[PDB]
Amino acid sequence: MEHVAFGSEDIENTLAKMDDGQLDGLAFGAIQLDGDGNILQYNAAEGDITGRDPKQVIGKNFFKDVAPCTDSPEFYGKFKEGVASGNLNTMFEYTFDYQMTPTKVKVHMKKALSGDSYWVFVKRV
């Protein structure tokens, strides 16, 4: 395991050093998106929650293709405003339900340390 706690204040600095391999060691789901919502990284833990195969979703658009249930003001709406503002740090509960058993999760979205990338972190509640 990589020891990092969900919701940690300095999480973006810690994750900056991790490769896809290390990301797979986290205790929670982690997705990295570009400013358009394309998936740059997707870890094993997120795959465990959602059923998606991590290698098969990289390169696809999270909001349009992979996770249309997040296409709403409550999720996508918050992401887009964060991208526009260049600042994002929000935590909320949500239910993932597209092609899967409805699963309640806690979501934390945060701007990454690099210019135009964004993290989505996910854990069961």
Ligand X SMILES: *C(=O)/C=C\c1ccc(O)cc1
Q: How far is the CB of 46 from ligand X (least distance, A)?
A: 5
Do 18 and 108 form a contact (C-beta atoms < 8 A)? Answer: no
Is the Cβ–Cβ distance between 22 and 30 less than 8 Å?
A: no
Judged by CB under 6 A, the stretch of 8-16, 17-25, 61-69, 111-119 that binds ligand X is: 61-69
> Binding to ligand X (CB under 6 A): which residues in 1-40?
none
Contact status: 121 vs ligand X (CB under 6 A): no
Counting contacts by CB under 6 A, is residue 43 touching ligand X?
no
> Which single residue brings its beta carbon nearest to ligand X?
69
3-state secondary structure the chain: CCCCCCCCCCHHHHHCCCCHHHHCCCCCEEEEEECCCEEEEECHHHHHHHCCCHHHHCCCEHHHHHCHHHCCCCCHHHHHHHHHHCCCEEEEEEEECCCCCCEEEEEEEEECCCCCEEEEEEEEC
Shortest separation between residue 114's beta carbon and ligand X, angstroms: 21
Contact code string over 65-104 relative to ligand X, x by CB under 6 A:
-xx-xx-------------------------xxx------
Shortest approach of ligand X to residue 107 CB, angstroms? Answer: 9
Residues that bind ligand X (CB under 6 A): 46, 50, 52, 66-67, 69-70, 96-98
